[PDB]
């Protein structure tokens, strides 16, 4: 597909809110990792460089609070946080949007190899 004309994350929210709200007990080779502070930057890094060549200019911010450190999604067009994802749900969001974005991007140039299978 073509991501250069992609502006929306509706299909992502569709999936994400289906998942988060209807949580299951099943393994489908879903990325399961202990989300350490280093792990945030890892997924956030590749996440940004996937959306930059599109209209979906989301600016992901890492902000720590009390015991947690979550990634808040700031929409560049409005300069406000439209979505806040805690680290313990970031893995699902990561997959949710990766399936979506990887349908647009050339599933060869992605070279984002998280070796845990």
Swiss-Prot record:
SUPFAM superfamilies: FlaG-like. It comes from the Bacteria. PANTHER family: PROTEIN FLAG. This is Uncharacterized protein YvyC. The gene is yvyC.
């Amino acid at each position: 597909l073509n991501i250069e004309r992609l502006t929306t994350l509706q299909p992502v929210w569709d999936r994400y809110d289906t998942q988060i709200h209807n949580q299951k007990d099943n393994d489908n080779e879903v990325p399961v990792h202990q989300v350490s502070y280093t792990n945030l930057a890892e997924m956030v890094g590749e996440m940004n460089k996937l959306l930059e060549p599109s209209q979906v200019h989301l600016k992901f911010e890492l902000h720590d609070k009390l015991n947690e450190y979550y990634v808040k999604v700031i929409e560049d067009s409005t300069n406000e946080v439209i979505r806040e994802i805690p680290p313990k749900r970031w893995l699902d969001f990561y997959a949710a949007m990766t399936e979506f974005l990887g349908l647009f991007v050339d599933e060869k140039k992605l070279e984002h190899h998280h070796h845990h299978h």
